[PDB]
Design an enzyme around this catalytic site. Structure first.
Site, short mmCIF file in Angstrom:
data_model
loop_
_atom_site.label_atom_id
_atom_site.label_comp_id
_atom_site.label_asym_id
_atom_site.label_seq_id
_atom_site.Cartn_x
_atom_site.Cartn_y
_atom_site.Cartn_z
N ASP A 115 0.77 -1.23 0.00
CA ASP A 115 0.00 0.00 0.00
C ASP A 115 0.82 1.30 0.00
OD1 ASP A 115 -2.47 1.62 0.46
OD2 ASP A 115 -3.27 -0.39 0.93
N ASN A 120 -13.67 -0.16 -7.13
CA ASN A 120 -14.83 0.67 -6.77
C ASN A 120 -15.39 1.28 -8.05
OD1 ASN A 120 -14.39 0.29 -3.88
ND2 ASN A 120 -12.72 1.79 -4.03
N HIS A 176 -4.38 5.71 3.66
CA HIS A 176 -4.94 4.48 3.09
C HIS A 176 -4.26 3.21 3.60
CE1 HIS A 176 -5.90 1.62 -0.25
NE2 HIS A 176 -7.01 2.32 -0.34
N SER A 218 -11.20 -1.50 -0.97
CA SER A 218 -9.83 -1.40 -0.40
C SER A 218 -9.83 -1.86 1.07
CB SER A 218 -9.34 0.06 -0.43
OG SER A 218 -8.72 0.35 -1.67
C1 LIG Z 1 -9.15 1.30 -2.63
O1 LIG Z 1 -9.48 2.26 -2.14
C2 LIG Z 1 -8.87 1.16 -3.98
C3 LIG Z 1 -8.83 -0.03 -4.41
C4 LIG Z 1 -8.68 -0.38 -5.81
C5 LIG Z 1 -8.35 -1.61 -6.22
C6 LIG Z 1 -8.46 -2.00 -7.60
C7 LIG Z 1 -8.88 -1.13 -8.58
C8 LIG Z 1 -9.11 0.18 -8.18
C9 LIG Z 1 -9.05 0.56 -6.80
#
Ligand SMILES: *C(=O)/C=C/c1ccccc1
Ligand SMILES: [Ca+2]
Length: 274
Positions: free
Chosen positions: A32, A154, A63, A220
């Protein structure tokens, strides 16, 4: 006083912990934006950074610290509680403070985790496109015996259109979707044939930059719930292979509807860690 996010009991992680299984001895790598390692409710053991100018133990975004909290926020008398609070936590920075990273950086992170014996890899990130190098990295990590979990995306629904991003779309990676505390799929959850399982993704309370806690929405947040589950299944049966841990998660998931929208259903770790 310590808060228990609704996500813990919803996936039945509390029942497994109560049995004494909290992921002790399992190495989980969170690919991350880093982790605020000085957070009083976290215990980062190590990690690496492939982002120029940023060390791995600082989180300028928030995040990565939030995702890291869902998996292993310490079980104490403050903050919140993670799915596998006794897990060995490794922060692998592959995204910058603005939440974005290059393929090479991510692939480097996946490889570092594979070479350093990580048991589980959580990747709460995703792109519209993939890459042969990235695909090869996950196939190999999975083949080496590492459980790979990724946020499904998302992107929501769009009349038949499949909205699952990479690396979640690869066969070697578990694509996780999001449900709310009522267990209904959250509107922002990506939909598509590759969808595998669901997990709490809306209104998730976890650790946040500079010794605090916040609530975030997204797949996420759902992802770390599954990586924490895998860690729990592994601390109870260290003899299982990745595909075995993987199958246990989807085979026992609580059915919610069409796999296009919910995959195999909401995960139930008490059933999976049987
Ligand atoms: C999380 O906040 C974002 C995750 C993510 C994973 C895969 C594709 C777009 C975003
Ligand atoms: Ca705590």
């Amino acid at each position: 006083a310590q808060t228990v996010p609704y996500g813990i009991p919803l996936i039945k992680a509390d029942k497994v912990q109560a049995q004494g299984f909290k992921g002790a001895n399992v190495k989980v790598a969170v690919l991350d934006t880093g982790i605020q390692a000085s957070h009083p409710d976290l215990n980062v053991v190590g990690g690496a950074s492939f982002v120029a100018g940023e060390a791995y133990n600082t989180d300028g975004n928030g995040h990565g610290t939030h995702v890291a909290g869902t998996v292993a926020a310490l079980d104490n008398t403050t903050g919140v509680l993670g799915v596998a609070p006794s897990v060995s936590l490794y922060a692998v920075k592959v995204l910058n403070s603005s939440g974005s990273g290059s393929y090479s950086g991510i692939v480097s992170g996946i490889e570092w985790a594979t070479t350093n014996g990580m048991d589980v890899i959580n990747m709460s990130l995703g792109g519209a496109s993939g890459s042969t190098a990235m695909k090869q990295a996950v196939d190999n990590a999975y083949a080496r015996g590492v459980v790979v979990v990724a946020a499904a995306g998302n992107s929501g629904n769009s009349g038949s259109t499949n909205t699952i991003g990479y690396p979640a779309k690869y066969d070697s990676v578990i694509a996780v979707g999001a449900v709310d505390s009522n267990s209904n799929r959250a509107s922002f959850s990506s939909v598509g044939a590759e969808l595998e399982v669901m997990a709490p993704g809306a209104g998730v309370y976890s650790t946040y930059p500079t010794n605090t806690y916040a609530t975030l929405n997204g797949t996420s947040m759902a992802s770390p719930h599954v990586a924490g589950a895998a860690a729990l299944i592994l601390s109870k049966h260290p003899n299982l292979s990745a595909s075995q841990v993987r199958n246990r998660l989807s085979s026992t998931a609580t059915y919610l509807g069409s796999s296009f929208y919910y995959g195999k259903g909401l995960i139930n770790v008490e059933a999976a860690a049987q």
